[PDB]
């Protein structure tokens, strides 16, 4: 048995991949070989110091650069914002709401939903540091729903757009509603319905101090980012992306938190990709290095 075969087989095990016809697997896994070589040309350059960040195989393994990012594109967007007022406080060092104010990585799977779990993690980023209590919350109910609000459950969504939704309804939580990566029917319930919002604050687009004041002095906050296949095998690390901008934004993430390292400032970001990406999930990407990938250029955060 070779590396490769194993590398393989515990991918597909790791990954519950049963994939729909024989051939679709051996294609999936000559694509899984290709990208087992580019983490790796990737981690050379690593070990060498030329990159900050180490790639890893992760269930994106099986996947191509242009599957992954027509994935990242799928879910592209297609009164109650309020404007945000900057704290005009010294930036606190460093946030990491991770330990108090998320909730699970999860995965928005093959559903380009990313919109409605950039919400879900703002608005529990609030129930958590505004209530005192997190809820994880419902994409689904998010996906479900909202679609007169201009999203489109799994071809994308816009986080603002989700805010005014549950601002209308509200949200169940993700127990209640629990996800099912693919759009359906609205089975919103009112009455259990664990908050709505009074609004959403847009902060400055493109502007990092901003977004830092926003995370430190109100909680985890939704942002776009330009998403691109760099971010297909991250793994740990000072992500920093020489291929995304600012502007094609493509993918709901949030922000949960920022801090320097040796000097290095970064963001933390929770992503919707599993846990079995990145850092548990999170990763972090460079801070005050141009709004790298337009993480501060679409960012915002719900008033309870």
């Not at 679709?24 to 790796?40: C, G, P, S, T, Y």
């Not at 009164?79 to 104010?101: E, G, H, I, Q, T």
Request: a negative charge; aromatic letters at 12%; charged letters at 20%.
């Amino acid at each position: 048995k070779s590396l490769f075969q194993e590398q393989w087989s515990q991918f597909k095990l790791t990954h519950k991949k049963s994939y729909s016809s024989p051939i679709e697997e051996i294609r999936r896994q000559l694509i899984f070989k290709d990208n087992v070589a580019k983490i790796a040309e990737h981690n050379a350059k690593f070990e060498k110091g030329e990159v900050t960040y180490s790639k890893a195989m992760n269930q994106f393994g099986d996947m191509s650069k242009e599957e992954f990012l027509a994935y990242v594109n799928r879910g592209k967007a297609q009164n109650l914002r309020m404007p945000y007022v900057s704290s005009k406080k010294p930036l606190a060092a460093s946030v990491d709401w991770r330990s108090n104010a998320v909730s699970e990585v999860k995965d928005q799977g093959q559903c380009g939903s990313s919109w409605s779990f950039s919400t879900t993690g703002a608005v529990e980023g609030q129930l958590a540091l505004q209530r005192g209590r997190l809820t994880s919350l419902s994409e689904q109910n998010l996906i479900d729903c909202s679609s007169s609000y201009g999203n489109a459950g799994c071809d994308g969504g816009w986080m603002d757009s989700a805010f005014s939704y549950i601002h209308d309804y509200g949200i169940m939580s993700e127990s209640a509603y629990p996800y099912e990566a693919q759009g359906d029917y609205c089975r919103f319930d009112s009455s259990q319905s664990v908050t709505t919002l009074s609004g959403y604050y847009d902060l400055p687009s493109g502007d990092e101090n901003s977004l830092a004041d926003a995370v430190g002095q109100a909680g985890p906050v939704a942002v776009a980012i330009d998403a691109t296949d760099e971010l297909q095998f991250y793994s740990g690390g000072l992500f920093y992306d020489q291929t995304c901008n600012q502007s094609d934004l493509n993918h709901g993430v949030l922000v949960v938190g920022y801090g320097s390292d040796n000097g290095q400032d970064y963001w933390i970001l929770k992503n919707s990709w599993g846990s079995g990406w990145g850092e548990s999930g999170y990763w972090r990407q460079v801070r005050n290095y141009g709004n790298n990938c337009g993480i501060a250029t679409a960012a915002s955060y719900p008033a309870l």
